[PDB]
Structures are given as C-alpha cells and as structure tokens.
Amino acid sequence: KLHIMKEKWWRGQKIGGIFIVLAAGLVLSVLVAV
Amino acid sequence: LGVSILYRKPNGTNPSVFSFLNPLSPDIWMYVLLAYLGVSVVLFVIAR
Amino acid sequence: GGIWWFFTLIIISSYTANLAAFLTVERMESPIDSADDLAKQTKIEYGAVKDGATMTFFKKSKISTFEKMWAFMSSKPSALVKNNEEGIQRTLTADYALLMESTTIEYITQRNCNLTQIGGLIDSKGYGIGTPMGSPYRDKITIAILQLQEEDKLHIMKEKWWRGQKIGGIFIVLAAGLVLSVLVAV
Amino acid sequence: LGVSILYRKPNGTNPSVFSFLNPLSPDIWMYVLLAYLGVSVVLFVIARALSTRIIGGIWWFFTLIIISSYTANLAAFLTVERMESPIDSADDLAKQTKIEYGAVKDGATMTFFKKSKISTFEKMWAFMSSKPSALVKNNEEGIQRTLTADYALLME
Amino acid sequence: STTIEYITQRNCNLTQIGGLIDSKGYGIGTPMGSPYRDKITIAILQLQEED
C-alpha cells in the first residue's frame, strides 16, 4: 500500500502515389483515332 | 587454465520466398500485378 | 510502353537496392568475442563467483577494461550472484554472461547442447599439487608430471572424465519453370 | 631516434579469377547451367506465338531478379570491404587488449619503459608484465613471434 | 613546427601535411666556458625523466 498510495498520488505505402504518377499518362491513344 | 565465458546460441532457420519478398509490402507485392494487369487488359482492349 | 519500361525499371531497381541494403545490414553486423566487447557494451549482464577468487582477482586486476568491468560488478549486485545454478539459470533466462573456471565450462558444455563458449582464457591460474614443506618427493611428483604429461595421460583421462541463404533460397522459382511449361500446349 | 611499431599487412590476397565469382556459390552457377539446358531444347519440341512468349517473359523477369540479386551481393561485399579500418597508434593498443606487443625483454627498452611513467604507457608496461608467458627477448625471438603470431614490437 | 602546432590548435580549419623534415634543436645560450653546463645537462635529463 506503499505502492497503492504511489498509484493514488501518481496516476492520472512509401511508393503508392508513384503508380498514379504513371497513370497520369492514360489519355494518350484516345485522340489519335482521327 | 584461465577464466573464460559461456553463452547460449541464438539461432533460427527459415529460408524461403516469403523470406525473399520481404522489404516490399505483400499488399504492394500483389499491387505489382494489380498495376500490371491493367496494362495487359488495355493491350487486349486496343488490340481487338 | 516506353514510360512503362522506364517506370518498371524504377520499380525493380528500387526493390533491388532495397534488399541490397538489407543484405548489407546482414553482412555489416558483428558477433561478440572479447571482453573489450563487454567493456564497450552495457546492455548485457556479466559476472563470476560472488565473493570468489575470480571476484577478488577482479578487485586485484590492473587493466582498465577489467577494472571498469569490476566497477560494473561492484556497482550492480543484481548480476552478482553466488551459486553455480543461480548463474546457470541467470544465463538461461537473462542476458547474462559468466566468467568462470574453463574446465568447469568444459564439463557443463558436455551436458547441455544449448551453450556456446566465448573467447579463450583470460588469464593463467595453475592448480597445483603441494607437499609438506621441504620434501624431495615433491620433485619425484614433478618429474612424474613431466614424463606423464609428456605421455599425455592427463589428456586421455580428461576426455575420459569430462565427456558426455537466399543464396539457398530462390530455387522454388528455379524449379517453377517446368510447372509453367506443362500447361502451355494443352 | 625513438621507438616505433612494425607488423605485416594483409595476409592472403587473391588475383583472377577466384576473386570475381566469389559471392555466388558454385552449385548455383550449375543451377544457371541446368536452367539454360531447360531453355535450349524447347525449340525442337516446338518443331515437334504468345505461348512461348509468356514463358520467355517470365524467364526475362526471373533473370532480372537473378542479376539484381548478384549485383546486390557484389556491392554488399564492396561497401564493407571499404568500411574496413586498420589501426596505427599506441592509443589503439591502449584501448584494445587482443593484440600482443613487446620490447627487448630485460633490455634498456624494457627497463626504460618500466621507468616511463605516463599512466597510459606504464599501464602498457603493467599489461606486458601481466601476460608473462608471451614474453620473448631477442631478435629472432621477435621475428618468430611476429611472423607466426599476432605480435607487435617495440624496438630500436 | 611547434609554432605550426600552435597555429593548428588555435585555428580549427587546418590540415597538417606530413611531419618533420629534419632535426633542429633549440638550446638555451650558455657562454663559452660556462661552468654550469654539466648541471644543465643533468637537469635536462632529470626533467626528461620527469616528463
């Protein structure tokens, strides 16, 4: 109860965006159709 | 004789591909082929 | 396709250098043999016979490595225990090394397969045989010691009484090629 | 004059070819061999095309892993091979304990450094007296103590 | 070179190139026929034993 008194007184994915950095260039062959 | 010291042996053995794929995350390890297969299905789209 | 090429090269070089670096972590680490290791380490307990001739000798020793090792022992009685089996379980449980009699270590190591000896002998103590003072039979014992250690019967009796990577780890993928090639035709 | 220290350098060396293949274990080269033997016979079975192309691309990917792994092992040797560090000074010996050293035993060197009273250096004297069975005296004595054993020397 | 050492210890931006070139011995001037010279040599070797 020394220590119960002591309690009484004392207590109180690094690389994920790189894939979409690649995926930014996805619209490339879209407008080549004409 | 003279004074000398005993100790115990730290040990453990597990050589595997699980112990080979390790500095990259297994979720990111399947995300390798996740990001890959979009390329092959875009190949299959514009090829047909 | 060219930027995909570019990108995947970045990928493979990245994980390449990653596990390369971890491989260097593997090769860069050192094991421990000397007590100079113990003088520079702190985290591991180490000790001997409490109030033993070992312990008195570390009081009497004059090398500052062993002097501050002795000072560690003098400051910390928690590692400093007396009985043999006390220290045996202190080793088997806690991170504690034990400087002790090496022939006793030899007998211990024959009786447990979970141990490893560290280093060699620190010093030199000659357990000898004594006579009543002023005896020529001392010299008979001495010459018999010469001839019999010359015959190494002490060695025979000592053995008679004391005894009792991914280098290897990628070959799954090496073998994987045939179980690839079985289902390509039909 | 004064007193300095002598020792040999770099026991063991390796010229070609053994110093090149060395991180890679020899049976793994034979695994490369039998892998190549698996490669080199498929075309006659073909005589007996995305089908083999996906196999070749997985082979491609595999040998990328192979070369990346080996080069990783190479550079892993090289960096610790440059992380290496030798010692020179007597303070190195003042810190270490493993390496043996000595002077002309019962000579003017020995008694003079017995009378030399730098706490480091008379501490080294206490070291040298403390391991008495390592002591040799003469010239050929220290030559044989050095050529065979790890032993520095303190001589004219 | 001892002045060089005084320079290096006082100024934290110096790299010493090599060591000694030769032997130059500074002594304290005695007159010709000074009667104290043996005592000076004895005291020099004494102080060298004293460090």
For residues B2 and E16, give the distance between their C-alpha atoms in angstroms, rounded to a whole number.
46
Q: Residue C80: how many CB atoms within 10 A of its CB? A: 19
Q: Which residue of A has its CA nearest to C4?
A: A22
CA-based nearest residue in chain E for residue D119: E51
Smallest Cα–Cα separation from D66: which of C180, B36, A16, C177? C177
Q: Quote the DSSP letter at residue C94.
A: S
Which residue, chain included where needed, has tokens 């095309």? D49
In this structure, the strands spanning D151-154 and C96-101 are unpaired
Joined together, the tokens standing for residue B8 give: 């115990």
Cα distance between residue D142 and residue D137, in whole Å: 7
Which residues in chain D have their CB less than 8 angstroms from residue E51's CB?
A: 117-118
Which one-letter amino acid corresponds to residue D67? I
CA D69 – CA C170 distance, rounded (Å): 10
E49 contacts D115? CB cut-off 8 A: yes
D98 vs C64, D143, D149, D151, E2, CA distance in Å?
14, 19, 12, 10, 35
Structure solved via: cryo-EM
C60 vs C67: CA distance, rounded Å: 9
Is D72 annotated in some ligand binding site?
no
For D52, the enclosing helix (H) or strand (E) is: helix D50-83
What's CA D87's distance to the chain center, in Å? 14
- C123 and C129 Cβ atoms separated by less than 8 Å: no
- How many angstroms separate the CA atoms of D112 and C125, rounded? 29
**Resolution number, Å:** 7.6
Residue C65 counted as an annotated binding residue: no
d(CA D47, CA D30): 28
The answer to whether residues D134 and D102 touch, using CB atoms and an 8 Å cutoff, is yes
Rounded CA separation D69/C23 (Å):
10
Cβ-proximal residues to D130 (8 Å cutoff; 6+ apart), any chain? C62, C63
> What number of other Cβ atoms are within 10 A of residue C101's Cβ?
20
φ, ψ dihedrals at C11, nearest 5°: -60, -55
Residues of D in contact with C23 (CB under 8 A): 72-73, 76
Q: How many CB atoms neighbour CB D150 within 10 A?
A: 12
Chain A residues whose CB is inside 8 A of the C13 CB are: none
- What tokens does D73 get? 């092992």
How near does any CA of chain C get to the CA of B48, in Å?
Answer: 18
Report yes or no: B7 and C105 within 8 Å, Cβ to Cβ: no
* Contact of C134 with B14, CB cutoff 8 Å: no
Of D108, D115, D143, D132, the C-alpha closest to D8 is D143
Nearest Cα residue to D7 out of D121, D152, D155: D152
CA D117 to chain centre: 36
Contact C3/A22, CB-based, under 8 Å? yes
